[PDB]
Design a protein around this ligand. Structure first.
Ligand SMILES: Nc1nc2c(ncn2[C@@H]2O[C@H](COP(=O)(O)OP(=O)(O)O)[C@@H](O)[C@H]2O)c(=O)[nH]1
Length: 170
């Protein structure tokens, strides 16, 4: 007997230095396990948060620019996405270098990942005069995008909500 909280598995992936760690910490806080991927010194962060009565397991994937097989990072990440089948892939994208960030995003879509796009660093883009038409972006990609500035703690609660929804979309 007892309670059964419905549970989900989500993965965070993006280029290095886009706010992945910042977003991971904001989502999971103190519930966090830090270890290595097997037989390797690549860090594996996992944690969970609870939202609207459901449990969300988060795994931080290694930062990568592409999902070929040019590094063990890429191999680890690709193998996880294809073969561990997360309920949702949150692709964290840096608004201050969209074009280069989207290279990875495209491969992700092309793998049939259940995608949600977290468009981070909106504040940095604003201050550098970088213009992003978020709507045009959603439309062209055909994936939901959530603008935020995780370091400034804005849009994180949006992200949480959008995640709880994009997950029921498997
Ligand atoms: N301006 C700005 N900086 C950010 C934001 N999110 C993260 N950063 C900074 O970007 C740098 C890299 O963030 P981090 O989470 O370590 O990126 P990661 O390598 O993808 O895991 C850090 O100095 C963060 O403080 C944001 O929304 N706006």
């Amino acid at each position: 007997g007892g309670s059964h909280m419905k549970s989900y598995e989500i993965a965070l992936i993006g280029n290095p230095n886009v706010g992945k760690s910042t977003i991971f910490n904001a989502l999971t806080g103190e519930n966090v396990y830090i270890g290595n991927w097997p037989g390797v010194t690549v860090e594996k962060k996992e944690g969970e948060f609870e939202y609207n009565g459901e449990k969300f397991k988060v795994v931080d994937l290694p930062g990568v620019y592409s999902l070929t097989a040019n590094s063990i990072d890429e191999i680890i990440a690709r193998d996880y996405i294809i073969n561990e089948k997360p309920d949702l892939v949150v692709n964290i994208v840096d608004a201050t270098a969209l074009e280069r960030n989207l290279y990875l995003t495209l491969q992700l879509m092309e793998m049939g990942a259940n995608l949600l796009l977290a468009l981070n660093k909106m504040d940095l883009a604003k201050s550098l005069g970088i213009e992003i038409d978020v709507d045009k972006l959603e439309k062209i990609l055909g994936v939901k995008v959530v603008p935020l500035s995780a370091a400034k703690k804005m849009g994180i609660e949006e992200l949480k909500k959008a995640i709880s929804i994009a997950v029921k979309d498997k």
